[PDB]
Amino acid sequence: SPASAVAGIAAAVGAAVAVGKLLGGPDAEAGRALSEGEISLAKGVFGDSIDYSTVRLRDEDYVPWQGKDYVMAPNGHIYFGEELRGVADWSLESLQRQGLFIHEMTHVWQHQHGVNVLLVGAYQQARQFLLGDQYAYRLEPGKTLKDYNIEQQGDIVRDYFLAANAFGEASANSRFAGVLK
Amino acid sequence: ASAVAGIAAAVGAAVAVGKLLGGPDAEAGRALSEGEISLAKGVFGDSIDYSTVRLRDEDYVPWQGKDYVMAPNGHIYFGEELRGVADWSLESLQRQGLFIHEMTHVWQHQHGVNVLLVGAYQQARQFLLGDQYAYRLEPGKTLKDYNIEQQGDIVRDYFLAANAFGEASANSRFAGVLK
Ligand SMILES: [Zn+2]
Ligand SMILES: [Zn+2]
């Protein structure tokens, strides 16, 4: 069983390097670019920290093993699954659907700030599965965003956006002020 | 620590390439020539369907070498330095031996072997665990008791012995390993 852990994690990173090297870098001209409302939505969270020009919404899977009800953001482009296709404007969808979009955008923000969301992601996803680590983040004093895994990083940012839209900036900034910089 | 990691990462990358570009385009590449079918028939006979077999003068993966050849799916992928060969049967005996070696994997694939996974595992295990790549014939050891790669070398070296020293000298040395 501890033999399965090292093996499983390495095999998952190996598969990530393979996909990375194989279909290396996305076609800037392919997909669809962010809408006026979508740029506004993300600007309210990320501001001018990300170049929204780069960001592309592709209604196609990144890999054949990607789920029907799943979304990937490895290269700074967002790949929508079979059940999440046909959305022209994410800013004109439900608050929970908008939250999903802010989540994927955090991976796009990570990528734009020098993070290998493909490798780092594959490693952390496999490590939390086999090493049984808790899926849900737990806020701690002295812990910044960067001390969490790339998926929790997203969950945090999304949950902040949802708190700020549902309970106002007052309630949101009190809880998330520590973790964000 | 590096061994378990390295081997698993190598098999993981193989499953990824396998799942990703799964199965080759039967109509793509180039099919075996009359001479090439004859060449292989003398070794493999009617054990393989030569119709399936396709010679593609393109890399299987970007990390494949200039002086390297891959045969993972029952199609042969030629590297940068091995391109432009219209007929392998009209090339040097050593160049024909290479072709028989690649054909052994094509024969393994056609007989139920996952050349991609089994290969990636064995190649990585032989590198990190520093195990002897070069086969050494042993009594009681059948071809199936050797690496998918050794299996390729054994069959090729047999073909070369049979062409250079005749079937007499070749069949005396290789009769044991082959069935
Ligand atoms: Zn995600
Ligand atoms: Zn080979």
DSSP one-letter string for chain B: -HHHHHHHHHHHHHHHHHHHT-S--TTSS-BPPHHHHHHHHHHHTTSS-TTT-BEESS-SSTTS-TT-EE-SSSSEEE-GGG---S-GGGS-HHHHHHHHHHHHHHHHHHTT--HHHHHHHHHHHHHHS----S----TT--GGGS-HHHHHHHHHHHHHHHHHSHHHHHHHHHTTT--
Chain A partners of B9 at a C-beta cutoff of 8 Å? 10-11, 13-14, 17
Contact of A9 with B7, CB cutoff 8 Å? no
CB contact under 8 A, A14 and B20: no
CB proximity under 8 Å: B 20-49 to A: 20-22
Q: Which of A57, A55, A75, A54 lies closest to A119, judged by CA? A: A75
Contact of A37 with A147, CB cutoff 8 Å? no
Contact of B156 with B42, CB cutoff 8 Å? no
CB contact under 8 A, B13 and A8: no
CA gap A88, A59 in Å, rounded: 10
The single residue listed with the structure tokens 């956006």 is A161
CA gap A23, A46 in Å, rounded: 28
How far does CA A160 lie from the centroid of its chain? Answer: 14
Percent helix, strand and coil across chain A, each rounded to 5?
Answer: 55, 5, 40
Closest-CA residue of B relative to A14 is B9
Centroid of ligand 2 to alpha carbon of B149 (angstroms): 6
Give strand pairing partners of B41. none
CA gap A76, A85 in Å, rounded: 18
Residue range(s) defining the domain that contains residue B8: 1-179
Sort B150 into a burial class: Cβ within 10 Å, 0-12 / 13-18 / 19+. buried
B8 contact A CB<8A: yes
Task: Say how many domains are in chain A.
Answer: 1
CB contact under 8 A, B12 and A21: no
Tokens of B65: 């070498």
- Looking at this protein, which amino acid is placed at residue A129? F
Sort A68 into a burial class: Cβ within 10 Å, 0-12 / 13-18 / 19+. exposed
Contact of A71 with A81, CB cutoff 8 Å? yes
Centroid of ligand 2 to alpha carbon of B100 (angstroms): 10
Centroid of ligand 1 to alpha carbon of A4 (angstroms): 25
Tokens of A63: 């890999």
Q: B76-78 and B69-70: which strand pairing?
A: antiparallel
Contact of B14 with B121, CB cutoff 8 Å? yes
CB contact under 8 A, A6 and B6: no
For residue B75, say whether it is annotated as part of any ligand binding site: no
3-state secondary structure of A147: helix
Chain A partners of B11 at a C-beta cutoff of 8 Å? 11, 14
Read off φ and ψ for residue A149, nearest 5 degrees. Answer: -80, 160
